[PDB]
Amino acid sequence: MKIAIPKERRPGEDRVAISPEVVKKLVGLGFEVIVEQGAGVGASITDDALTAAGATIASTAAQALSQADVVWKVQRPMTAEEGTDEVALIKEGAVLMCHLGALTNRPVVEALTKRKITAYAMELMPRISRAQSMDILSSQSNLAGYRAVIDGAYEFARAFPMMMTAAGTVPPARVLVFGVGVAGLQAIATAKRLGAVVMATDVRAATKEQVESLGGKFITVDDEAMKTAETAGGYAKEMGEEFRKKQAEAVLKELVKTDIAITTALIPGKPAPVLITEEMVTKMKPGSVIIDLAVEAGGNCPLSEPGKIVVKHGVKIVGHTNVPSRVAADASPLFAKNLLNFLTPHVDKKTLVMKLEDETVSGTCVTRDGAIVHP
Amino acid sequence: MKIAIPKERRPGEDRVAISPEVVKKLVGLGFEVIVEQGAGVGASITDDALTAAGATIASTAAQALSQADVVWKVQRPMTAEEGTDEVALIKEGAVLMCHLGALTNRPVVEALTKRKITAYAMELMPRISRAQSMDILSSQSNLAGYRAVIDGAYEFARAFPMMMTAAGTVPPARVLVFGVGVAGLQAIATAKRLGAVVMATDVRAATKEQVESLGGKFITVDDEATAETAGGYAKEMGEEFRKKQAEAVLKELVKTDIAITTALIPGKPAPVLITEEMVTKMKPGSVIIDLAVEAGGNCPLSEPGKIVVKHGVKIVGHTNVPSRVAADASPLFAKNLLNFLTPHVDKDTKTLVMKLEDETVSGTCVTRDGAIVHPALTGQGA
Numbered sequence: 001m002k003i004a005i006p007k008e009r010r011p012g013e014d015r016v017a018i019s020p021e022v023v024k025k026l027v028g029l030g031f032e033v034i035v036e037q038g039a040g041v042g043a044s045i046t047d048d049a050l051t052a053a054g055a056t057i058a059s060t061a062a063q064a065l066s067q068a069d070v071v072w073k074v075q076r077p078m079t080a081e082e083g084t085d086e087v088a089l090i091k092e093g094a095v096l097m098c099h100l101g102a103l104t105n106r107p108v109v110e111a112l113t114k115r116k117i118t119a120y121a122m123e124l125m126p127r128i129s130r131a132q133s134m135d136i137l138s139s140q141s142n143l144a145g146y147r148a149v150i151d152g153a154y155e156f157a158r159a160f161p162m163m164m165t166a167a168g169t170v171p172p173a174r175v176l177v178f179g180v181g182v183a184g185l186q187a188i189a190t191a192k193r194l195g196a197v198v199m200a201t202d203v204r205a206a207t208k209e210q211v212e213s214l215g216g217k218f219i220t221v222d223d224e225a226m227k228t229a230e231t232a233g234g235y236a237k238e239m240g241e242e243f244r245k246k247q248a249e250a251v252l253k254e255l256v257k258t259d260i261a262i263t264t265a266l267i268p269g270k271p272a273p274v275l276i277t278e279e280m281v282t283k284m285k286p287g288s289v290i291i292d293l294a295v296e297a298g299g300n301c302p303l304s305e306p307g308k309i310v311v312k313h314g315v316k317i318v319g320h321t322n323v324p325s326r327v328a329a330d331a332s333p334l335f336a337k338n339l340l341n342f343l344t345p346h347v348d349k350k351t352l353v354m355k356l357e358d359e360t361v362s363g364t365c366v367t368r369d370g371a372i373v374h375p
Numbered sequence: 376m377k378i379a380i381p382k383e384r385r386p387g388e389d390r391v392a393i394s395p396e397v398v399k400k401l402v403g404l405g406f407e408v409i410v411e412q413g414a415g416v417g418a419s420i421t422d423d424a425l426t427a428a429g430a431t432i433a434s435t436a437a438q439a440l441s442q443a444d445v446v447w448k449v450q451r452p453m454t455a456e457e458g459t460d461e462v463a464l465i466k467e468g469a470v471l472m473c474h475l476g477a478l479t480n481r482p483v484v485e486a487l488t489k490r491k492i493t494a495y496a497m498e499l500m501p502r503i504s505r506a507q508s509m510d511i512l513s514s515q516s517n518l519a520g521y522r523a524v525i526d527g528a529y530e531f532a533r534a535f536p537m538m539m540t541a542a543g544t545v546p547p548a549r550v551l552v553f554g555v556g557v558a559g560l561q562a563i564a565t566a567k568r569l570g571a572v573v574m575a576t577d578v579r580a581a582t583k584e585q586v587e588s589l590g591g592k593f594i595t596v597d598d599e600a601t602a603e604t605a606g607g608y609a610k611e612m613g614e615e616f617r618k619k620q621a622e623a624v625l626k627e628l629v630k631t632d633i634a635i636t637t638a639l640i641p642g643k644p645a646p647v648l649i650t651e652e653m654v655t656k657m658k659p660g661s662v663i664i665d666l667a668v669e670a671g672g673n674c675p676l677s678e679p680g681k682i683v684v685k686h687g688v689k690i691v692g693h694t695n696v697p698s699r700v701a702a703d704a705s706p707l708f709a710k711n712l713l714n715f716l717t718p719h720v721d722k723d724t725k726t727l728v729m730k731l732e733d734e735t736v737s738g739t740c741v742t743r744d745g746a747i748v749h750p751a752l753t754g755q756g757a
């Protein structure tokens with residue numbers, strides 16, 4: 001069997017769904033591994049390094065994908081309506097594994113269905129502990145949370161650590177992390193190791209102890225309300241306006257002293273919760289920066305604009321798109337490993353047969369043999 | 376007496392030679408403090424903050440400097456030949472304290488002398504222990520070393536720290552610091568703070584223990600080969616050493632992710648530490664931060680003010696690195712100035728008598744009352 005990995009064509013996408021270390025594992029499993037010439041340039045993974053690991057280099061996308069039984073990629077394939085029909089390059093009946101954005105992108109699923117492709121939408125990986133090594137949302141989020149602090153520190157005109165020199169002492173940066181999920185925890189860790197005084201808040205009560213064990217200060221809003229705020233999947237529930245007002249009052253006290261506010265909150269199937277209103281940014285100190293990591297989902301701050309740095313009220317509101325690609329050389333090997341861990345169990349002693357009864361397979365499959373599975 | 380601070384006008388300068396805390400001290404010493412409006416915007420220091428500290432706000436640079444007995448600024452004032460005659464705004468007989476670039480800028484010294492201005496070139500602060508609090512080179516350098524690591528991490532496509540995820544582990548970045556002076560020491564500490572593996576090298580033997588104290592690893596070249604001069608300064612070691620230093624460095628440099636070069640030599644172009652040949656051997660995706668770019672660079676591929684991309688490597692050569700940390704750089708530069716001035720103030724007489732026998736005064740004064748003082752600045756007008 002042949003597995004192919006093309007170059008990512010969507011604008012700004014520097015990640016690639018492969019690594020030399022994953023190529024060797026695939027070859028050891030019996031695959032012919034094909035990668036498009038130059039697919040790993042953005043991730044610092046050369047064609048020679050892939051060849052040395054056992055891969056075959058194809059000169060074009062069409063040539064790489066032409067006979068592939070399994071296609072691995074990072075973002076969903078582009079369709080004819082977008083100007084470049086990447087779906088048409090996938091062999092009819094083949095398997096596709098990638099971040100499909102299935103719930104938000106019906107036409108790509110429909111296009112795949114027409115070619116009878118079996119598509120596993122990696123972002124739908126079931127929230128079960130044995131699937132943590134296969135979860136692309138947490139491996140990429142982890143890097144995004146680190147990146148937020150680096151982007152914050154780059155845009156900030158003071159140093160993060162408190163420095164005590166012969167000339168005098170300069171205070172540390174004060175960082176506030178809104179939403180302490182996977183990205184938020186790495187944001188806290190990164191900011192803390194740099195020397196910042198770190199504060200953080202979240203609706204889930206389980207988060208408090210995680211914040212404190214990293215040396216952050218948790219901002220308590222509604223103690224007992226936090227008790228019922230988590231879902232069974234581990235996500236936050238919609239809280240409401242009464243809490244919204246509460247949250248703001250607790251937060252504002254620290255936000256007026258905050259140098260860097262990092263916002264990462266998401267709500268399953270909903271627009272991002274507004275955590276930093278325009279009124280609130282008005283009370284912030286001149287020179288402060290907001291890193292809105294939820295900008296593509298609506299933003300936790302209404303002033304953030306996707307792919308831009310907006311300046312308003314003396315505050316820089318940073319809203320880069322595709323933050324994981326700003327750490328592409330680390331993001332790629334981890335994304336590649338997520339795909340390898342998901343696929344490996346279905347190879348035996350030597351073919352690949354996806355076990356359809358496996359919960360990670362049925363939970364991720366959005367279309368198969370011309371039929372849409374999870375509408 | 377009146378002390379005035381104008382807005383910095385050189386291109387890219389965001390620092391300001393003042394802070395609210397320093398204004399308070401100056402007012403406490405009997406000074407009237409005036410700052411040009413908007414002077415601290417780049418450093419996040421508002422006029423209101425300065426007014427609340429006891430300073431007055433002047434509408435223009437000329438209104439700010441016209442009656443000032445003492446003038447503080449960051450970079451050397453511009454002359455008539457540069458488009459804005461800033462020295463013309465300084466009252467005749469006033470005292471100027473700033474980074475003058477005195478030994479490399481004749482025109483400014485001549486202009487100042489012509490108006491009988493007494494100028495203290497802060498960059499010539501004697502390297503004595505009691506003057507450390509007055510030293511603008513080290514306060515500014517320390518922030519530049521921190522900033523090199525932030526700029527490096529910003530330009531690099533991998534995280535600095537080792538990260539242990541459920542998906543697998545990603546190894547830490549490897550950093551190689553060349554030149555372990557004030558800037559190099561801060562680059563080591565900040566790179567270590569971020570969990571990087573840090574290697575470093577310098578011609579001064581004593582640096583080794585400073586590197587190890589921060590958890591970094593020293594690249595030895597020639598243990599035996601008298602390097603530190605009397606001022607705590609290094610040098611021009613010869614071609615022999617240069618070839619030998621390149622050798623051991625290569626082994627680490629071939630696996631390095633971020634190389635931060637900070638080496639300088641008093642009165643000479645910066646030493647070449649990373650040849651083009653050597654950048655050819657680095658991993659694609661690697662980044663070089665050349666903090667010595669303005670003195671000619673430690674890497675010949677660096678160009679002032681640019682990020683050069685060659686051989687898959689980013690060669691970063693921003694100018695005025697301290698200004699990339701202006702909101703911390705400004706308060707420290709202001710304190711350096713305050714620490715140098717304070718001893719000479721006589722509160723009851725409201726006079727400024729710079730003690731001539733004071734080593735900091737004699738080491739820094741380049742012109743006084745219309746007569747050049749620094750021995751290297753004597754000469755004919757242009």
Ligand SMILES: NC(=O)c1ccc[n+]([C@@H]2O[C@H](COP(=O)([O-])OP(=O)(O)OC[C@H]3O[C@@H](n4cnc5c(N)ncnc54)[C@H](O)[C@@H]3O)[C@@H](O)[C@H]2O)c1
Pocket residue numbers: 502503507510512513516553554555556557558559576577578579606607608609610611612637638639640641646648
């Ligand atoms: N900055 C000041 O004015 C000042 C004031 C007081 C004390 N000091 C002390 O003086 C020492 C020098 O520090 P600095 O920041 O001013 O140095 P610097 O800016 O002049 O040079 C940076 C470092 O580059 C090194 N270097 C020079 N040529 C080199 C080469 N070919 N290869 C490798 N490294 C090379 C130097 O030894 C120095 O340590 C330190 O101990 C500092 O604490 C400096």
